[PDB]
């Protein structure tokens, strides 16, 4: 039930709403008002999926798929079997995520720790909402959103992307990718540094963060430090997801043509737009 050192930590208090009504634990899971709001939105939402499963004629996860209401419906409502369920489910879903964020806030409070984890999470939630909400609304229908299916949601990425040619040319999507790459690199390096210092060669004594800060200076001529590498992770991670929403919010709204033809602003600049030779000349 408890970690050898957990009892001194489980004290009353920290609850944003409710007081002490749901201020207890279920096994190793902390409950809380939002702990109960979550189980609700989730249970109900899982039901709407098993029901959108009988209406499709399949119980195979690899087949099961909940599609959005066709473009003819706009931002209006739709019959359950035809766009209805997805819509309640996006509500149950959005309701499950925000409620899980607020449940971490109550946890944060108990322990007296910082509210950086729920904050971070909120960036994830915003990406989801960018796709199932902010973008569709801006375009004019819930048909521009993605479906809830293991392989059908990928069909959407695929079709959605090429709908503008090689999506690779989206400037924002371009940036967003580097942060995703960098983060991995940093995550590799970091977990690889700490582990090496605390796990040296045989018979040798545990190295110190001084050996660590050296190692990198000897390697790249610089050591960001402990507090820095963590500020770096968090920053690259969130920055990576920030440019992913930004690349999609502008796709179909301010820019709806071929992304490759956008980079023609740079090439057709009066200064060199007509000098013969090169690739375009």
């Amino acid at each position: 039930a408890l970690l050898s050192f957990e009892r001194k930590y489980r004290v009353p208090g920290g609850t944003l709403v409710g007081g002490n009504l749901f201020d207890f634990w279920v096994g190793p899971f902390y409950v809380g008002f939002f702990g109960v709001a979550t189980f609700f939105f989730a249970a109900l939402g899982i039901i709407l999926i098993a029901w959108s499963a009988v209406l499709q004629g399949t119980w195979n996860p690899q087949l099961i798929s909940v599609y959005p209401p066709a473009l003819e419906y706009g931002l209006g409502g739709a019959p359950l079997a035809k766009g209805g369920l997805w819509q309640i489910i996006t509500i149950c879903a959005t309701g499950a995520f925000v409620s899980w964020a607020l449940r971490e806030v109550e946890i944060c409070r108990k322990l007296g720790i910082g509210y950086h984890i729920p904050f971070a999470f909120a960036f994830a939630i915003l990406a989801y909402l960018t796709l199932v909400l902010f973008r569709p609304v801006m375009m004019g229908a819930w048909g521009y959103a993605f479906p809830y299916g293991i392989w059908t949601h990928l069909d959407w990425v695929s079709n959605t992307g090429y709908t503008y040619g090689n999506f690779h040319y989206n400037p924002a999507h371009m940036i967003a990718i580097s942060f995703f790459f960098t983060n991995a690199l940093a995550l590799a390096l970091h977990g690889a540094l700490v582990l090496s210092a605390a796990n040296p060669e045989k018979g040798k004594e545990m190295r110190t963060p001084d050996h660590a800060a050296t190692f990198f200076r000897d390697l790249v001529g610089y050591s960001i430090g402990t507090l820095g590498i963590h500020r770096l992770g968090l920053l690259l991670s969130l920055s990576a997801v920030f440019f992913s929403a930004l690349c999609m919010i502008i796709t179909g709204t301010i820019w709806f043509d071929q992304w490759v033809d956008w980079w023609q602003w740079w090439v057709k600049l009066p200064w060199w737009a007509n000098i013969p030779g090169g690739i375009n000349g």
């Binding site: 970690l3 050192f5 007296g112 800060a213």
Partner: protein, 240 residues
């Protein structure tokens, strides 16, 4: 075919990996226990990992984990319900008894040494060459509490020499004694330092150190711990 074989292999591999990874995160905190401190029944699918010994630097001994765990201190808590799974109420003054968000750990009562044998955290007056390169200089400023009434003034900046970074701010009260407030708990301003965590009358409560030139691992925790638990316990003495 190969592909189908490569992929069937991976998942078998990944399963051993997750197996491998989880047992490793059980070196500390396990085995689990019942609310009364006795060995819990259901310990989970994964078993405890074979012990591993670390060789602490500067010949300070060894560390074997998993190893016999103990809080090595008295806990001032009591049950609030007759069923396992509820909060335990502080029998005294949480801040002083060391529980909840104000609890600490019985770390080693020895200061931290850098790669070269020297204490890792020193005051700045004892740190030759160090100075405030940028940002407002806290030393000299009054420290205000979460009740808007002054509690003291900054006298020095205990810095981390190896990472050249301020960890604490020495503070002088009325009785003329000093205290350590963690850097990550104060807002340094243009004319004052703010501590939303503690209220005027709680700085004296802060645990004090034995040597005026060193903070031990144990003392670091009591300090940081005490300062943090006041976000909950000092709440009735704050205004926004």
């Amino acid at each position: 075919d190969l592909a189908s074989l490569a992929i069937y292999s991976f998942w078998i591999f990944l399963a051993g990996l997750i197996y491998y990874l989880q047992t490793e995160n059980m070196r500390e905190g396990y085995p689990l226990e019942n609310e009364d401190g006795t060995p819990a029944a259901n310990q989970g699918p994964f078993p405890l990992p074979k012990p591993k010994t670390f060789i602490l630097p500067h010949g300070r001994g060894t560390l074997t984990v998993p190893g016999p765990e103990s809080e090595d201190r008295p806990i001032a808590l009591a049950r609030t319900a007759v069923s396992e799974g509820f909060p335990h109420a502080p029998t005294g003054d949480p801040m002083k008894d060391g529980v909840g968000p104000a609890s600490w750990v019985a770390r080693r009562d020895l200061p931290e040494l850098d790669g070269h044998g020297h204490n890792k955290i020193k005051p700045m007056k004892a740190a030759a060459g160090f100075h405030v390169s940028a940002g407002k200089n806290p030393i000299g400023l009054p420290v205000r509490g979460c009740d808007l009434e002054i509690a003291g003034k900054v006298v020095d900046i205990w810095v981390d020499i190896p990472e050249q970074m301020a960890r604490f701010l020495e503070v002088e009260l009325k009785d003329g004694s000093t205290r350590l407030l963690p850097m990550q708990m104060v807002k340094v301003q243009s004319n004052r330092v703010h501590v939303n965590a503690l209220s005027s009358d709680l700085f004296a409560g802060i645990p004090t150190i034995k040597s005026p030139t060193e903070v031990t691992l144990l003392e670091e925790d009591k300090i940081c711990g005490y300062v943090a638990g006041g976000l909950m316990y000092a709440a009735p003495k704050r205004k926004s």
